[PDB]
Design a protein around this ligand. Structure first.
Ligand SMILES: [Cl-]
Ligand SMILES: [Fe+3]
Length: 206
């Protein structure tokens, strides 16, 4: 009956980490985390990747993280170039502060999701793929679309609704169920990746 809609956080690091802490999700405005020319590069690079259906959602894998296995680079060489940006010193410091820990974090899984009109992502928990995922990061590469809100459903709270634009970045804790609502026009393209302090094998049973 009631849903809490969020705009991009207009503050700084102290504000970003506090919203992630209290709310569990924060949306950063373009182009704080990744500069526009960097997103332009990522966009040119991901196009070169092989696409597979997963048919109203098409997925371009960069890094896979199968049950019982350790994270694996795939679709070389352009996957690694994208990953190099995601894990460079600027981003490592940026998300290190964002998460509020000195501990080393690893990017375990990473892919481009291309969602066509009338696609959606039903309710789920990222922890179900890997119980050690702590945070998820989503970069919006979709130039223009309707619908497609990223919705988080924390236990005993109103849903938190995020409408993302090109260049925005959502950071969210994997402790909350979440979903993407129906895409209502053109297509919605996002780079999604997952952070864990564990770099060993995925403890989800295969
Ligand atoms: Cl910029
Ligand atoms: Fe998810």
């Amino acid at each position: 009956t009631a849903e809490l809609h969020f705009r991009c956080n207009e503050g700084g690091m102290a504000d970003y980490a506090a919203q992630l802490r209290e709310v569990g999700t924060v949306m950063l405005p373009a182009y704080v985390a990744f500069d526009a020319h960097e997103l332009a590069r990522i966009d040119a690079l991901q196009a070169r990747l092989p696409e597979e259906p997963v048919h109203d959602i098409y997925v371009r894998r960069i890094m896979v993280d199968r049950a019982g296995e350790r994270p694996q680079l795939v679709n070389l060489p352009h996957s690694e170039t994208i990953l190099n940006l995601l894990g460079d010193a600027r981003r490592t410091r940026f998300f290190g502060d964002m998460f509020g820990t000195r501990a080393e974090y690893f990017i375990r899984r990473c892919q481009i999701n291309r969602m066509l009109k009338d696609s959606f992502i039903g309710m789920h928990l990222d922890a179900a793929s890997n119980p050690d995922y702590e945070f998820s990061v989503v970069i919006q590469l979709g130039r223009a679309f309707d619908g497609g809100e990223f919705v988080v459903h924390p236990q005993g709270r109103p849903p938190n609704v995020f409408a993302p634009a090109y260049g925005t970045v959502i950071v969210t804790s994997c402790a909350h169920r979440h979903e993407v609502r129906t895409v209502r026009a053109n297509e919605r393209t996002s780079l999604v990746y997952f952070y864990s302090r564990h770099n060993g094998a995925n403890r989800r049973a295969a």
